Amino acid sequence: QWRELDAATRGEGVYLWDSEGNKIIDGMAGLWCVNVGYGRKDFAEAARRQMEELPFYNTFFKTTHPAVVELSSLLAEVTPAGFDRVFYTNSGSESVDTMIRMVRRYWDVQGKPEKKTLIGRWNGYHGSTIGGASLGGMKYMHGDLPIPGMAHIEQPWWYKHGKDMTPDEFGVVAARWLEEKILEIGADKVAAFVGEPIQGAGGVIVPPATYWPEIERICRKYDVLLVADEVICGFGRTGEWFGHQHFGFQPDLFTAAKGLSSGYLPIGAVFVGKRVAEGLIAGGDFNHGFTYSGHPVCAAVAHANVAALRDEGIVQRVKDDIGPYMQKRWRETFSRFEHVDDVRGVGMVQAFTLVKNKAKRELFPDFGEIGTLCRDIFFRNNLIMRACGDHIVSAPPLVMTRAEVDEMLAVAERCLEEFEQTLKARGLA
Amino acid sequence: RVMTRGEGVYLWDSEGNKIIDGMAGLWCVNVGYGRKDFAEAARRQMEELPFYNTFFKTTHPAVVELSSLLAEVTPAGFDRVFYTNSGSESVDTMIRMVRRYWDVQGKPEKKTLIGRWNGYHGSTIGGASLGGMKYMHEQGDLPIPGMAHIEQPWWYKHGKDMTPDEFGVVAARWLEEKILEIGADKVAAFVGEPIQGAGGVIVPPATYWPEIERICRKYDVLLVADEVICGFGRTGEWFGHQHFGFQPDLFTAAKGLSSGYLPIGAVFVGKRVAEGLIAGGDFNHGFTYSGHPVCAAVAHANVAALRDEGIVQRVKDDIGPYMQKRWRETFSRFEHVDDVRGVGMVQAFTLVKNKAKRELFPDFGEIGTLCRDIFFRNNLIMRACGDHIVSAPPLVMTRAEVDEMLAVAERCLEEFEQTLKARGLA
């Protein structure tokens, strides 16, 4: 009946439940976002409390809503220095859209109305808004997109574009693709470069260690703003509070998604560095949001989420305990298989790639076909892992226990033992 | 001044001063404040299942339940809804659907959407482009391609010697002339708020929309209503386009769907367009898996209340007519107030330099801020859109509360007139 109306039961910890009684291991944590796992009844209480006390705070008053002030203050403590001014929204997509406007408007204030082009990457994802889909580098997205002033460079995907280079060597090369694009367009027309510290929807593409430092060198060289999209890597996913902290680059601003509330309520934000912030304040355009922005109820729940991620040592636990454990076990489990390679990951994000031949580094034809097939197995065994093309990705709730990790891998191991079984059964060597 | 509480149509500050909210948050708090039963709906849903995954072949029940409910309050033909987080996202999504739709029909050149100057459709790059705010077209480098604009049906300004009913036909035909200037083969849709809200509650003549609709059909152009404000009982009908009597192919909604208690939005897709998108496959995912359970649960409670408690029906039959009658009885006498207008529970008027010449004050907006500051000093929230003064209080407002709000409002304008003459601006 539910399927019928749709076409026209529970969650707790890292587990989900169906009406058939079967438990389900959610290795995706909703949409990369449910970082503290499900069943957080103190979040529900924080939401109720706020929706019964003050669910609104109107412009009429000089001040701003307490819960927002309280959230802004807590976030300042967990975010790196120079990000006191935050701009709240309802989603990561809206975050990206907003920062696209802030980026262009900033240069206007700086008396450089030519600097409007943002450079993204192919296979990069930055939301579903028109501007967001334009900044992204997905094909099946490209509403007459992209909009003007949007350019793209190739992604740091060593396995495919690495040739005979070492990852670190390929990191420099891949990063200098940006320099090439900048000189092609003209630095005076380039406003910013935007990238996920790790490409999420693109199949968890982890760039070499040399990549981001080189991207930053180039940005600073040509006076191009550096923007990180923490949509997925945000809030402990890599072990650090933010992806750009792990890879060691400092963006002028960055975008966050509902991971900020572990997906319990819709919310997002753009964190604006001092340099850019003073530019926007000098303009006066986004001053209304730096003050009045943020839905009270969502702020309250988001506050409790952040407070929990820090106070309960969930984030620190990813960097010290469960992260290193997940990476070692992930690599121990998937390195045996004949059609699995490029096993990768950091903190609580992992992935690998289904391949025809590991020796040749030969990918399967019709990139995506074999991935979906492997996904179907995962879904028959009540294990949720996502297939981005022929990439299998993982991103469970950060509070997952070592025991729960082994359990998940145990199931995943079966699925692949079967995957290669079906593979050879269909004649796909 | 610190806000402590909200109850019904009032806001209370830290000192105990009562504040009449004549704007209902942002045109959205329709059932009023102090709704503790919604808090329960949210609480319950968030403890049980505050999310849903695409592993199953099902859609979260709370969402299905909401969809099923909305289908009963929306006109026939609107069975499929695409949920979002805000009115802005709805507009942006609607833009992508409209264009994707014509791609399915083999008409890839049919991509230009037409809006109106002084129109408002969110704050996203696409929404701002479709909107007609000039102070908003420069920032962000707007508008984006495939976006055009026609003049607004503002009679007081562009009415000349025509009667409103005649002006309504002329204003509507601006759409046709634009379509022909661009070429019908390039026009994907026309988009408009049934009543321009942020523009200053611009109520078009009764002849406007019916003519707009005829033109859209004539040139095979999609018609899109933006119910960001008129939605959910504002005009007395569940949706503005119902009041003015036109059937859009899709319409967008904002957090009024949950009375602003939680961020939520939706795109309502008619038969024609829905069937089209399904043939594509681009959006088929969101017609089922889109929507946040908690927000959906609070929306369900809001919509259920709006209907089951006769709140909307009451606007149409009781407080609406009363509000309009009283609104006009109150402001008609003032020398520098004209174009007293409104319907249901959205009203407005315009501060003018001289009613005779229909002359407006210079620097449209300077005088609106002056008058607005008076409302605020007296703990009354009514918005100023230029020299336009607008009002859209909670639909559950009682008659006595209407009289109270109008009493203070009249007091503020008596002052306005005096400070106008004192400053030699009469």
mmCIF file of C-alpha atoms in Angstrom, chain B residues 81-405:
data_model
loop_
_atom_site.group_PDB
_atom_site.id
_atom_site.type_symbol
_atom_site.label_atom_id
_atom_site.label_comp_id
_atom_site.label_asym_id
_atom_site.label_seq_id
_atom_site.Cartn_x
_atom_site.Cartn_y
_atom_site.Cartn_z
ATOM 1 C CA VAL B 81 4.669 16.744 -5.878
ATOM 2 C CA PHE B 82 8.412 17.385 -5.698
ATOM 3 C CA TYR B 83 9.527 18.452 -2.222
ATOM 4 C CA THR B 84 12.319 20.906 -1.443
ATOM 5 C CA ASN B 85 13.689 22.886 1.505
ATOM 6 C CA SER B 86 12.467 26.373 0.557
ATOM 7 C CA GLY B 87 10.532 28.539 -1.876
ATOM 8 C CA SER B 88 13.826 29.494 -3.495
ATOM 9 C CA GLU B 89 14.692 25.858 -4.208
ATOM 10 C CA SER B 90 11.178 25.268 -5.541
ATOM 11 C CA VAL B 91 11.570 28.040 -8.112
ATOM 12 C CA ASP B 92 15.028 26.816 -9.124
ATOM 13 C CA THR B 93 13.705 23.265 -9.445
ATOM 14 C CA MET B 94 10.684 24.437 -11.431
ATOM 15 C CA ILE B 95 13.078 26.119 -13.871
ATOM 16 C CA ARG B 96 14.977 22.867 -14.428
ATOM 17 C CA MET B 97 11.732 20.904 -14.834
ATOM 18 C CA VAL B 98 10.279 23.380 -17.334
ATOM 19 C CA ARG B 99 13.378 23.202 -19.537
ATOM 20 C CA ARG B 100 13.830 19.446 -19.146
ATOM 21 C CA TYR B 101 10.183 19.092 -20.128
ATOM 22 C CA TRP B 102 10.565 20.763 -23.529
ATOM 23 C CA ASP B 103 13.695 18.687 -24.178
ATOM 24 C CA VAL B 104 11.478 15.609 -23.913
ATOM 25 C CA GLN B 105 9.142 17.080 -26.534
ATOM 26 C CA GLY B 106 12.049 17.479 -28.951
ATOM 27 C CA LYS B 107 11.921 21.257 -28.570
ATOM 28 C CA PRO B 108 15.392 22.143 -27.197
ATOM 29 C CA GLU B 109 15.117 25.799 -28.278
ATOM 30 C CA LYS B 110 12.067 26.246 -26.045
ATOM 31 C CA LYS B 111 14.093 27.446 -23.060
ATOM 32 C CA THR B 112 13.298 31.083 -22.245
ATOM 33 C CA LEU B 113 11.211 31.761 -19.143
ATOM 34 C CA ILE B 114 9.393 35.086 -18.859
ATOM 35 C CA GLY B 115 8.889 36.921 -15.581
ATOM 36 C CA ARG B 116 7.923 40.442 -14.566
ATOM 37 C CA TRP B 117 9.750 43.511 -13.300
ATOM 38 C CA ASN B 118 9.157 43.865 -9.559
ATOM 39 C CA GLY B 119 8.483 40.126 -9.416
ATOM 40 C CA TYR B 120 10.131 37.951 -6.769
ATOM 41 C CA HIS B 121 10.999 34.265 -7.059
ATOM 42 C CA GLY B 122 13.596 33.438 -4.414
ATOM 43 C CA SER B 123 17.275 34.220 -3.914
ATOM 44 C CA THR B 124 19.044 31.518 -5.936
ATOM 45 C CA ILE B 125 20.956 32.473 -9.072
ATOM 46 C CA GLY B 126 18.089 31.156 -11.189
ATOM 47 C CA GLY B 127 15.363 32.538 -8.952
ATOM 48 C CA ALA B 128 16.921 35.997 -8.888
ATOM 49 C CA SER B 129 17.277 35.919 -12.669
ATOM 50 C CA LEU B 130 13.600 35.087 -13.120
ATOM 51 C CA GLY B 131 12.686 37.680 -10.508
ATOM 52 C CA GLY B 132 12.455 41.277 -11.681
ATOM 53 C CA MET B 133 14.254 43.164 -8.925
ATOM 54 C CA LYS B 134 16.832 45.513 -10.455
ATOM 55 C CA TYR B 135 18.745 45.992 -7.201
ATOM 56 C CA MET B 136 19.087 42.212 -7.395
ATOM 57 C CA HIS B 137 20.090 41.700 -11.045
ATOM 58 C CA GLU B 138 23.523 43.301 -10.755
ATOM 59 C CA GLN B 139 24.890 41.181 -7.908
ATOM 60 C CA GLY B 140 25.768 37.666 -9.051
ATOM 61 C CA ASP B 141 25.867 38.786 -12.684
ATOM 62 C CA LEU B 142 22.186 38.292 -13.487
ATOM 63 C CA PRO B 143 19.979 37.355 -15.133
ATOM 64 C CA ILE B 144 21.213 34.091 -16.631
ATOM 65 C CA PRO B 145 20.457 33.255 -20.295
ATOM 66 C CA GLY B 146 16.934 32.319 -21.377
ATOM 67 C CA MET B 147 15.346 34.804 -18.988
ATOM 68 C CA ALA B 148 13.152 37.744 -20.049
ATOM 69 C CA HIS B 149 10.801 40.204 -18.336
ATOM 70 C CA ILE B 150 7.616 42.171 -19.030
ATOM 71 C CA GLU B 151 6.117 45.109 -17.135
ATOM 72 C CA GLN B 152 4.021 44.442 -14.027
ATOM 73 C CA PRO B 153 0.222 44.908 -13.930
ATOM 74 C CA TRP B 154 0.531 47.955 -11.662
ATOM 75 C CA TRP B 155 -2.517 50.022 -12.602
ATOM 76 C CA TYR B 156 -1.849 53.005 -10.336
ATOM 77 C CA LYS B 157 1.354 53.557 -12.315
ATOM 78 C CA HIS B 158 0.776 52.215 -15.827
ATOM 79 C CA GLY B 159 -3.015 52.488 -15.855
ATOM 80 C CA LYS B 160 -3.106 55.805 -17.691
ATOM 81 C CA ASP B 161 -6.738 56.610 -18.526
ATOM 82 C CA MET B 162 -7.836 52.968 -18.655
ATOM 83 C CA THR B 163 -10.164 51.312 -16.170
ATOM 84 C CA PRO B 164 -8.502 48.488 -14.210
ATOM 85 C CA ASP B 165 -10.429 45.867 -16.219
ATOM 86 C CA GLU B 166 -9.127 47.380 -19.455
ATOM 87 C CA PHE B 167 -5.603 47.735 -18.089
ATOM 88 C CA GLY B 168 -5.681 44.080 -17.062
ATOM 89 C CA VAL B 169 -6.097 43.071 -20.697
ATOM 90 C CA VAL B 170 -3.357 45.398 -21.927
ATOM 91 C CA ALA B 171 -0.921 44.354 -19.202
ATOM 92 C CA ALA B 172 -1.576 40.689 -19.973
ATOM 93 C CA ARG B 173 -0.934 41.243 -23.683
ATOM 94 C CA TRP B 174 2.535 42.562 -22.861
ATOM 95 C CA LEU B 175 3.280 38.862 -22.472
ATOM 96 C CA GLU B 176 2.097 38.145 -26.013
ATOM 97 C CA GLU B 177 4.077 41.025 -27.513
ATOM 98 C CA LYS B 178 7.183 39.794 -25.704
ATOM 99 C CA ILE B 179 6.580 36.207 -26.828
ATOM 100 C CA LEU B 180 6.353 37.414 -30.424
ATOM 101 C CA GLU B 181 9.405 39.651 -30.007
ATOM 102 C CA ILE B 182 11.411 36.628 -28.855
ATOM 103 C CA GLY B 183 9.573 34.024 -30.917
ATOM 104 C CA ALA B 184 7.111 31.478 -29.533
ATOM 105 C CA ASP B 185 9.468 28.645 -30.490
ATOM 106 C CA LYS B 186 11.964 29.906 -27.895
ATOM 107 C CA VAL B 187 9.608 30.523 -24.967
ATOM 108 C CA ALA B 188 9.331 27.766 -22.363
ATOM 109 C CA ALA B 189 7.044 29.392 -19.799
ATOM 110 C CA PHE B 190 5.666 32.486 -18.125
ATOM 111 C CA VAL B 191 6.028 32.685 -14.339
ATOM 112 C CA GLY B 192 4.217 34.919 -11.877
ATOM 113 C CA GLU B 193 2.937 35.317 -8.342
ATOM 114 C CA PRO B 194 -0.872 35.442 -8.411
ATOM 115 C CA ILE B 195 -0.322 38.555 -6.309
ATOM 116 C CA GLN B 196 3.123 40.154 -6.274
ATOM 117 C CA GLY B 197 4.116 40.039 -2.616
ATOM 118 C CA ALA B 198 7.562 41.544 -2.103
ATOM 119 C CA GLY B 199 6.734 43.902 -4.968
ATOM 120 C CA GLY B 200 4.153 45.467 -2.664
ATOM 121 C CA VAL B 201 1.022 43.321 -2.925
ATOM 122 C CA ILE B 202 0.192 44.255 -6.510
ATOM 123 C CA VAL B 203 -3.348 43.000 -7.068
ATOM 124 C CA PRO B 204 -3.943 42.616 -10.817
ATOM 125 C CA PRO B 205 -7.316 43.370 -12.452
ATOM 126 C CA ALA B 206 -9.795 40.491 -12.714
ATOM 127 C CA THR B 207 -9.164 40.388 -16.477
ATOM 128 C CA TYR B 208 -5.399 39.896 -16.197
ATOM 129 C CA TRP B 209 -4.819 36.208 -15.451
ATOM 130 C CA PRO B 210 -7.590 34.825 -17.686
ATOM 131 C CA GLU B 211 -5.986 36.726 -20.570
ATOM 132 C CA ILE B 212 -2.495 35.617 -19.551
ATOM 133 C CA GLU B 213 -3.755 32.031 -19.633
ATOM 134 C CA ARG B 214 -5.331 32.398 -23.079
ATOM 135 C CA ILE B 215 -2.025 33.751 -24.391
ATOM 136 C CA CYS B 216 -0.049 30.884 -22.853
ATOM 137 C CA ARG B 217 -2.324 28.303 -24.473
ATOM 138 C CA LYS B 218 -2.195 30.194 -27.767
ATOM 139 C CA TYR B 219 1.594 30.002 -28.059
ATOM 140 C CA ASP B 220 1.947 26.637 -26.310
ATOM 141 C CA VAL B 221 3.748 28.157 -23.327
ATOM 142 C CA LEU B 222 3.704 26.630 -19.841
ATOM 143 C CA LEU B 223 1.997 28.700 -17.153
ATOM 144 C CA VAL B 224 3.554 28.722 -13.686
ATOM 145 C CA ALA B 225 2.028 30.223 -10.543
ATOM 146 C CA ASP B 226 4.321 31.084 -7.644
ATOM 147 C CA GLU B 227 2.300 30.413 -4.493
ATOM 148 C CA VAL B 228 5.203 31.456 -2.256
ATOM 149 C CA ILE B 229 2.802 33.832 -0.496
ATOM 150 C CA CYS B 230 -0.715 33.264 -1.834
ATOM 151 C CA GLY B 231 -0.337 29.591 -0.935
ATOM 152 C CA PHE B 232 -2.318 27.824 1.775
ATOM 153 C CA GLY B 233 -5.265 30.091 2.520
ATOM 154 C CA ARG B 234 -3.850 33.560 1.868
ATOM 155 C CA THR B 235 -6.549 34.689 -0.569
ATOM 156 C CA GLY B 236 -9.322 32.554 0.922
ATOM 157 C CA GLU B 237 -8.739 29.841 -1.644
ATOM 158 C CA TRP B 238 -6.084 27.222 -0.911
ATOM 159 C CA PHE B 239 -4.032 28.833 -3.690
ATOM 160 C CA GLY B 240 -3.950 32.271 -5.302
ATOM 161 C CA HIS B 241 -4.400 31.010 -8.858
ATOM 162 C CA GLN B 242 -7.716 29.531 -7.708
ATOM 163 C CA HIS B 243 -8.914 32.945 -6.569
ATOM 164 C CA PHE B 244 -8.034 34.655 -9.846
ATOM 165 C CA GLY B 245 -9.258 31.610 -11.753
ATOM 166 C CA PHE B 246 -6.415 30.235 -13.859
ATOM 167 C CA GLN B 247 -4.999 26.714 -14.096
ATOM 168 C CA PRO B 248 -1.179 26.615 -14.101
ATOM 169 C CA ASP B 249 0.764 23.635 -15.458
ATOM 170 C CA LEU B 250 2.802 23.752 -12.254
ATOM 171 C CA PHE B 251 3.087 25.960 -9.183
ATOM 172 C CA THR B 252 5.730 26.425 -6.501
ATOM 173 C CA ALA B 253 5.273 26.580 -2.734
ATOM 174 C CA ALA B 254 7.397 27.738 0.202
ATOM 175 C CA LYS B 255 7.512 27.139 3.968
ATOM 176 C CA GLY B 256 3.934 28.404 4.258
ATOM 177 C CA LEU B 257 3.267 24.701 3.713
ATOM 178 C CA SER B 258 4.425 24.208 7.313
ATOM 179 C CA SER B 259 3.509 27.725 8.451
ATOM 180 C CA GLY B 260 7.259 28.311 8.706
ATOM 181 C CA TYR B 261 7.613 25.942 11.664
ATOM 182 C CA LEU B 262 10.196 24.007 9.653
ATOM 183 C CA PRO B 263 12.024 24.685 6.374
ATOM 184 C CA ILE B 264 10.109 23.050 3.529
ATOM 185 C CA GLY B 265 8.981 23.690 -0.032
ATOM 186 C CA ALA B 266 7.345 21.913 -2.946
ATOM 187 C CA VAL B 267 6.788 21.992 -6.686
ATOM 188 C CA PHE B 268 3.299 20.851 -7.662
ATOM 189 C CA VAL B 269 3.353 19.335 -11.144
ATOM 190 C CA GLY B 270 0.229 19.104 -13.274
ATOM 191 C CA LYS B 271 -0.793 16.135 -15.401
ATOM 192 C CA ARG B 272 0.753 17.357 -18.654
ATOM 193 C CA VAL B 273 4.222 18.183 -17.337
ATOM 194 C CA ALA B 274 4.421 15.262 -14.901
ATOM 195 C CA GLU B 275 3.789 12.712 -17.647
ATOM 196 C CA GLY B 276 6.462 14.501 -19.670
ATOM 197 C CA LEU B 277 9.160 14.334 -17.004
ATOM 198 C CA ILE B 278 8.412 10.666 -16.324
ATOM 199 C CA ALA B 279 9.184 9.991 -19.989
ATOM 200 C CA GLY B 280 12.593 11.563 -19.380
ATOM 201 C CA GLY B 281 13.741 9.990 -16.124
ATOM 202 C CA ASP B 282 15.619 13.023 -14.805
ATOM 203 C CA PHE B 283 13.266 13.872 -11.937
ATOM 204 C CA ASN B 284 11.466 10.551 -11.389
ATOM 205 C CA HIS B 285 13.700 10.157 -8.324
ATOM 206 C CA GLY B 286 12.322 13.170 -6.463
ATOM 207 C CA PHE B 287 8.631 12.445 -7.009
ATOM 208 C CA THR B 288 9.153 9.508 -4.637
ATOM 209 C CA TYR B 289 12.305 9.831 -2.508
ATOM 210 C CA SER B 290 12.330 13.617 -2.003
ATOM 211 C CA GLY B 291 11.188 15.253 1.235
ATOM 212 C CA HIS B 292 12.407 15.329 4.832
ATOM 213 C CA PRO B 293 10.224 13.141 7.117
ATOM 214 C CA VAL B 294 10.252 15.481 10.133
ATOM 215 C CA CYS B 295 9.425 18.570 8.070
ATOM 216 C CA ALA B 296 6.830 16.519 6.188
ATOM 217 C CA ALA B 297 5.217 15.493 9.480
ATOM 218 C CA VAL B 298 5.003 19.098 10.665
ATOM 219 C CA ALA B 299 3.651 20.063 7.241
ATOM 220 C CA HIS B 300 1.004 17.344 7.460
ATOM 221 C CA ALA B 301 -0.120 18.745 10.815
ATOM 222 C CA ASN B 302 -0.216 22.246 9.350
ATOM 223 C CA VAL B 303 -2.248 21.271 6.286
ATOM 224 C CA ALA B 304 -4.519 19.022 8.353
ATOM 225 C CA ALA B 305 -5.137 21.910 10.743
ATOM 226 C CA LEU B 306 -5.747 24.406 7.933
ATOM 227 C CA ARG B 307 -8.515 22.151 6.600
ATOM 228 C CA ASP B 308 -9.910 20.224 9.571
ATOM 229 C CA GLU B 309 -10.124 23.369 11.711
ATOM 230 C CA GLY B 310 -11.826 25.379 8.968
ATOM 231 C CA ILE B 311 -9.052 27.977 9.010
ATOM 232 C CA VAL B 312 -8.955 28.405 5.226
ATOM 233 C CA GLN B 313 -12.729 28.196 4.833
ATOM 234 C CA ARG B 314 -12.967 30.868 7.528
ATOM 235 C CA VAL B 315 -10.798 33.290 5.546
ATOM 236 C CA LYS B 316 -13.070 32.919 2.521
ATOM 237 C CA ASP B 317 -16.354 33.199 4.427
ATOM 238 C CA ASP B 318 -15.669 35.218 7.583
ATOM 239 C CA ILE B 319 -12.454 37.051 8.471
ATOM 240 C CA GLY B 320 -11.413 37.702 4.870
ATOM 241 C CA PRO B 321 -14.385 39.888 3.868
ATOM 242 C CA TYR B 322 -14.314 41.472 7.328
ATOM 243 C CA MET B 323 -10.606 42.272 7.032
ATOM 244 C CA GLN B 324 -11.009 43.774 3.555
ATOM 245 C CA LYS B 325 -14.080 45.820 4.459
ATOM 246 C CA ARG B 326 -12.386 47.195 7.580
ATOM 247 C CA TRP B 327 -9.060 47.751 5.814
ATOM 248 C CA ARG B 328 -10.802 49.979 3.272
ATOM 249 C CA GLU B 329 -12.932 51.707 5.911
ATOM 250 C CA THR B 330 -9.778 52.595 7.843
ATOM 251 C CA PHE B 331 -7.306 53.959 5.305
ATOM 252 C CA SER B 332 -9.576 55.550 2.684
ATOM 253 C CA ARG B 333 -9.750 58.919 4.453
ATOM 254 C CA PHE B 334 -6.008 59.635 4.561
ATOM 255 C CA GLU B 335 -4.776 62.351 2.203
ATOM 256 C CA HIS B 336 -1.526 60.612 1.238
ATOM 257 C CA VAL B 337 -2.863 57.048 1.101
ATOM 258 C CA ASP B 338 -4.318 55.615 -2.104
ATOM 259 C CA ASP B 339 -4.906 52.373 -3.999
ATOM 260 C CA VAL B 340 -6.248 50.730 -0.851
ATOM 261 C CA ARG B 341 -6.408 47.088 -1.903
ATOM 262 C CA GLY B 342 -6.337 43.453 -0.856
ATOM 263 C CA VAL B 343 -8.210 40.167 -0.690
ATOM 264 C CA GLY B 344 -8.589 37.356 1.828
ATOM 265 C CA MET B 345 -5.923 38.079 4.439
ATOM 266 C CA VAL B 346 -3.439 40.080 2.371
ATOM 267 C CA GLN B 347 -3.994 43.840 2.207
ATOM 268 C CA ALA B 348 -2.021 46.944 1.310
ATOM 269 C CA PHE B 349 -2.039 50.563 0.225
ATOM 270 C CA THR B 350 0.383 53.058 -1.289
ATOM 271 C CA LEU B 351 1.800 56.251 0.178
ATOM 272 C CA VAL B 352 1.468 58.885 -2.547
ATOM 273 C CA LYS B 353 2.576 62.503 -2.961
ATOM 274 C CA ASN B 354 -0.754 63.493 -4.503
ATOM 275 C CA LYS B 355 -3.796 61.269 -5.035
ATOM 276 C CA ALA B 356 -5.160 63.479 -7.819
ATOM 277 C CA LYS B 357 -2.266 63.116 -10.263
ATOM 278 C CA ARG B 358 -1.641 59.621 -8.897
ATOM 279 C CA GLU B 359 1.798 61.140 -8.350
ATOM 280 C CA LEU B 360 4.266 59.089 -6.330
ATOM 281 C CA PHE B 361 6.876 60.440 -3.933
ATOM 282 C CA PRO B 362 10.401 60.876 -5.333
ATOM 283 C CA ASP B 363 12.964 58.189 -4.488
ATOM 284 C CA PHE B 364 10.250 55.537 -4.218
ATOM 285 C CA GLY B 365 10.851 53.959 -0.810
ATOM 286 C CA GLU B 366 12.163 56.868 1.252
ATOM 287 C CA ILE B 367 8.673 57.711 2.502
ATOM 288 C CA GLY B 368 7.831 54.046 3.031
ATOM 289 C CA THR B 369 10.676 53.666 5.516
ATOM 290 C CA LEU B 370 9.533 56.762 7.400
ATOM 291 C CA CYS B 371 6.032 55.335 7.795
ATOM 292 C CA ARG B 372 7.331 51.863 8.643
ATOM 293 C CA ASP B 373 9.521 53.219 11.445
ATOM 294 C CA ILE B 374 6.337 54.600 12.998
ATOM 295 C CA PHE B 375 4.634 51.196 12.946
ATOM 296 C CA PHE B 376 7.679 49.675 14.648
ATOM 297 C CA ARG B 377 7.883 52.346 17.355
ATOM 298 C CA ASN B 378 4.287 51.410 18.174
ATOM 299 C CA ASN B 379 4.887 47.654 18.236
ATOM 300 C CA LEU B 380 3.103 46.930 14.959
ATOM 301 C CA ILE B 381 4.766 44.876 12.233
ATOM 302 C CA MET B 382 3.717 45.924 8.748
ATOM 303 C CA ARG B 383 6.184 45.833 5.866
ATOM 304 C CA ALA B 384 7.171 48.589 3.450
ATOM 305 C CA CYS B 385 7.935 47.618 -0.146
ATOM 306 C CA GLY B 386 9.073 50.980 -1.443
ATOM 307 C CA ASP B 387 6.251 53.373 -0.595
ATOM 308 C CA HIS B 388 3.904 50.375 -0.539
ATOM 309 C CA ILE B 389 2.597 49.361 2.879
ATOM 310 C CA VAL B 390 1.616 45.694 3.052
ATOM 311 C CA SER B 391 0.030 43.341 5.580
ATOM 312 C CA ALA B 392 -0.462 39.577 5.811
ATOM 313 C CA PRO B 393 -1.142 38.493 9.431
ATOM 314 C CA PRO B 394 -1.877 34.922 10.618
ATOM 315 C CA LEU B 395 -5.100 33.548 9.116
ATOM 316 C CA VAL B 396 -6.414 32.578 12.557
ATOM 317 C CA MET B 397 -6.532 36.254 13.533
ATOM 318 C CA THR B 398 -9.885 37.008 15.171
ATOM 319 C CA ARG B 399 -12.077 39.997 14.318
ATOM 320 C CA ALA B 400 -11.160 41.760 17.566
ATOM 321 C CA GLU B 401 -7.485 41.409 16.636
ATOM 322 C CA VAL B 402 -8.176 42.893 13.211
ATOM 323 C CA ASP B 403 -9.809 45.884 14.892
ATOM 324 C CA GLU B 404 -6.842 46.195 17.257
ATOM 325 C CA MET B 405 -4.257 46.058 14.478
#
